[PDB]
Design a protein around this ligand. Structure first.
Ligand SMILES: O=C[C@H](O)[C@@H](O)[C@H](O)[C@H](O)COP(=O)(O)O
Ligand SMILES: O=C[C@H](O)[C@@H](O)[C@H](O)[C@H](O)COP(=O)(O)O
Ligand SMILES: *CC(=O)CC[C@H](N)C(=O)O
Ligand SMILES: *CC(=O)CC[C@H](N)C(=O)O
Lengths: 608, 608
């Protein structure tokens, strides 16, 4: 979820709403805002649906007032509904929340015993009621929040208001980000900087546990222990890119066709005299990178697949041990941790909660440093890492990562190249990597021209409810990304397996009706992969093979081929990703689903 | 596949058939036998389906003669059918094969170009046609084989016969297992030892690339060039355990209810006054185990899963780095090795080709040594490793592993305790490990009394075609195990996720009709897991939660609880498996599937 707050003399309804548009990557299940005028008169407006639904409702009945909060939702507790949308109230107390109150159960029953009525199924609602109860006891809003926070467990990025006193807002951070925007005779707060750029560029980032008492004229922050502290303000040079469809019918689609240009931008100023130049990390980065004897990657979903690909590259090309783990799993086990280990996070948004929590935990564990490979500058993961490599793909709007995945893999490979040279390996390893990467943009540009054939093939999944993906070696995580794309936007129950694993149980799902998608480059693994293919055909599976022209596959009634141009082996996994992106997109189009904003999802998951 | 062979004075058909029954764990798609007398009259008989089909058809028109080869199939190239069944022929040439001839397509084309007509879709057919072609050039069957073997790529444990000379059999090992049984006045050959125990206890294992010329009177072995080699004979003490159903309706059923006994056996002799004793490894095992700084585990399917459970234990309790990898994926990648690494393989049959392949590659890579956790004494895996820990569960017949999995976990945990003490960690770790292990049998006993409840719950899946499984931490690989079980024997499309990952895309699959099985012990992740569960209920999914009695779950229309007794954390993963084993079994019963022998599968995948 996304939160915005504003306090000024003019109406802030429009400022709040613009903020929500800009935070919609955080959730599009529902949205609301509450404003108060100088007389204490509150108008609350909420709608099930995307931010635009709210905007429309507000335009037909304008909300007047200089103080207000707003929220856009990815639902965790309680189904999407106007009833469950934020802001939630407890009479004069009004609250928006990005996070999860994990102990909502006990709190709820305790507040129910004190007389409060829960009208929603959200965990957020306990915040409103708890703060209401603390204020009954006497004191100011700040004191009430200060007594409440300690009772909450889990994450909260919250902004709290008492409509009887429109001069003040209380903000509290735990986990979820909160940024305060400082205006001129006004002040703002939001989940990220980008939301508030229209009104200001001066920002303060609340630290873990900070509480801030905000008025139009002042910002006073208290730390977790209740001490009064000064936080530093920065001037930001960020630029908001709202993204565009261009000539395309969907953002996913444009995003797929942008890859050649995207990749071309990722390489920009990083290839220098034929060699990977990572001089942007700063003058003494080679000092840190040279100590690296082990690499740990934490990520989620697609970014996790990109990590899984890179692992084959680090280990085989640069000889450097690499471990890749689902972030949420790493966070909560006690792990061994290796000597001279570099922590790497992969994330498009830089706002993923699981990935963040991993990073934060990593700070206590004594890695050599953290590197963030990210696509959104100023994002949480970026501000909190030691070092960052920006993918520079431009804004990605469709929930289904595309150009982010391939720019991420591009950046990973340039790292593999760079470390091979610091280890003092054959300069040829980097050379073959650099030659590959330079070629990719036009290699992909040519994959795009087979769109028509992929579209025709897609018709075959129109009545399908399952699909197996298969891959081998560094193409295995490509099968994973393929299945994920297809289940995400088409809702087909798609699933990936390392080609050798299928026979060891899951082969029993194979019947005349099961489609099986396969990527097959022309490499040393090809004969082994072909015998896995044959195993499937022997059981009656229908195969869809995106095969190299030279793989020697032959079309038949149970074996549908798409012939791929021969590509450089080093960039093959990126290359073979594209047709899988196209197939997913085209099958979504067939099924009539919402390609850009699939049901149940959000572009960035900001909670656990 | 399972190959049997025999050179006798007396009819060997019955010996051959008993061989197939004892190899049926390697394949049951089809089966065949070919026998010649002394005069040269060959009678070939093949049947689509289980070994029992072949045995029935041979009981009606008994196959007379002293020379013969036999086979039971797990299909990889061409569908299960009588046409596709071995033995395969080329006039007088007659072949049985365990393997895959990877370069079959080029081979088939060349042989077609020379007048050969291929009647089947198997790779095996090329072997018969190519032995027939080589013999036409000149010399003995032995010399013909010696020119043909070099032209074959991939794997092969084949026995060849020229019906016109029923006195001599040829045999070639590549990858695939091949053991020769020495008789008096007679000689034999089989995929494993147990198949030949009705006739002999004296055996010779063929090495990689060995060609054998076997009469009823002598055994001569040769290398790849053709030079005669000397292979030692051994006397086996192995006992054949046929498996039984006891009072139960299926083996899997029995094998589930036998876990408490089997674990009791697994433990016998390994628990010394609250401490783990692994002295069975030999007097200098500790010299080695004390060196271990890293653990590499290799396995497939359910065994890969037990490996995954142990990675959480090894890293958290013993603080030892541990990696687990799909045998098939590790084998064909260039990996980076860690200093002082112990290679562990896990296998119920000791007969899995990928795992075997993994372990053979490992010997070139410079690990400290190789430990096998197997359940089959004298299997390929056990022979080929430095060290072995037998799970002692008794033979498992059901394709779907039950007791094999829990006994593997038992051993792994003992090993975790053993290493913790060697590293000199607190003795309390080993204490709780041992204390937990001791309670495990009786805890399971008290789990199975809820069979009835599971059974009634299974009734909800009759109409279902999908299922999602969720776990966190060490219970995440148990989710994977539950899903693998359900797929395999009910054909329902079950898929597991780490609980916190579902939201990164796969949550799109959730609608009112999707069942979600969750394992929920009462530990420190409980409130995290609960968020994930609520995120599913928010989108409409039907939850099935197996939860500790005190986890605080409450029944609802979309929430079905199975309350579980309290368990020690250390053995929780093992514990929470058992209910998922029962759900799979009960659902399979509902779906009316063949539980012990599911479609497309074999109990042990002896090929790649
Ligand atoms: O395909 C869907 C998205 O690609 C999704 O899987 C995403 O990769 C994860 O939710 C992690 O997001 P970040 O890359 O922003 O951390
Ligand atoms: O569930 C079915 C079997 O358990 C299967 O998945 C098995 O785990 C693999 O074939 C590995 O074989 P081994 O355990 O015999 O090595
Ligand atoms: C999206 C977010 O931070 C969730 C807030 C709350 N838990 C909810 O509305 O479900
Ligand atoms: C089980 C086995 O060795 C396969 C042999 C051959 N490829 C076949 O019959 O398909």
């Amino acid at each position: 979820c996304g939160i915005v707050g504003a306090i000024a003399q003019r109406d802030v309804a429009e400022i709040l709403l613009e903020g929500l548009r800009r935070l919609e990557y955080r959730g599009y299940d529902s949205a609301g805002l509450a404003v108060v005028d100088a007389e204490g008169h509150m108008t609350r407006l909420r709608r099930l649906g995307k931010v635009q639904m709210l905007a429309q409702a507000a335009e037909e009945h304008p909300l007047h007032g200089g103080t207000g909060i707003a929220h856009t939702r990815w639902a965790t507790h309680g189904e999407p509904s106007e009833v469950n949308a934020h802001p939630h109230v407890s009479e004069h107390i009004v609250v928006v929340h990005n996070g999860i109150i994990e102990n909502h159960e006990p709190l709820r029953e305790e507040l129910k015993a004190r007389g409060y009525t829960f009208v929603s199924e959200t965990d957020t609602e306990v915040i409103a009621h708890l703060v209401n109860w603390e204020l009954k006891q006497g004191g100011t809003l700040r004191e009430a929040v200060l007594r409440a926070i300690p009772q909450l467990r889990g994450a909260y990025g919250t902004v709290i208001m008492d409509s009887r006193h429109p001069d003040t807002l209380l903000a509290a951070r735990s986990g979820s980000p909160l940024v305060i925007g400082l205006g001129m005779g006004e002040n703002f707060i939001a989940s990220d900087q980008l939301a508030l750029l229209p009104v200001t560029r001066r920002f303060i980032f609340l630290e873990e546990g900070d509480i801030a008492e905000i008025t139009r004229r002042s910002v006073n922050i208290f730390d977790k222990t209740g001490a009064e502290v000064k936080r530093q303000d920065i001037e930001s040079n960020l630029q908001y890119d709202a993204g565009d469809k261009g000539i395309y019918r969907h953002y996913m689609q444009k995003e797929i066709y942008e890859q050649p240009n995207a990749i071309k931008n990722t390489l920009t100023g990083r290839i220098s005299h034929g060699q990977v130049d990572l001089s942007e990390l700063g003058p003494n980065a080679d000092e840190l990178l040279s100590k690296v004897e082990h690499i740990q990657i934490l990520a989620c979903g697609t970014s996790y697949n990109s990590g899984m690909v890179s692992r084959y590259w680090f280990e085989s090309l640069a000889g450097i041990p690499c471990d890749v783990e689902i972030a949420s799993e790493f966070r909560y086990r006690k792990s061994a941790v290796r000597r001279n280990s570099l922590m790497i996070t992969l994330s498009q948004s830089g706002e993923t909660a699981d990935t963040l929590a991993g990073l934060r935990l990593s700070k206590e564990l004594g890695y050599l440093g953290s590197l963030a490979i990210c696509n959104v500058p100023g994002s949480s993961l970026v501000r909190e890492s030691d070092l960052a490599l920006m993918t520079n793909a431009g804004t990605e709007i469709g929930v289904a990562s595309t150009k982010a995945f391939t720019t991420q893999l591009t950046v990973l490979l340039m790292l593999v190249a760079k470390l091979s040279r610091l280890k003092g390996l054959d300069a040829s390893i980097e050379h073959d990597i650099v030659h590959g990467l330079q070629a990719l943009p036009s290699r992909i540009e040519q994959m795009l021209s087979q769109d028509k054939r992929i579209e025709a093939l897609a018709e075959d999944f129109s009545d399908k409810h399952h699909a197996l993906f298969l891959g081998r070696g560094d193409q295995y995580p490509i099968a994973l990304e393929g299945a994920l794309k297809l289940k995400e936007i088409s809702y087909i129950h798609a699933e990936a397996y390392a080609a050798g694993e299928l026979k060891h149980g899951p082969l029993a799902l194979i019947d005349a009706d099961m489609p099986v998608i396969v990527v097959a480059p022309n490499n040393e693994l090809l004969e082994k992969l072909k015998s896995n293919i044959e195993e499937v055909r022997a059981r009656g599976g229908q195969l869809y093979v995106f095969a190299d022209q030279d793989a020697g596959f032959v079309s038949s009634d149970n074996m549908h081929i798409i012939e791929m141009p021969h590509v450089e082996e080093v960039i093959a996994p990126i290359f073979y990703t594209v047709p899988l992106q196209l197939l997913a997109y085209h099958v979504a189009l067939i099924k009539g689903t919402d390609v850009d904003q699939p049901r149940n999802l959000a572009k960035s998951v900001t909670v656990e």
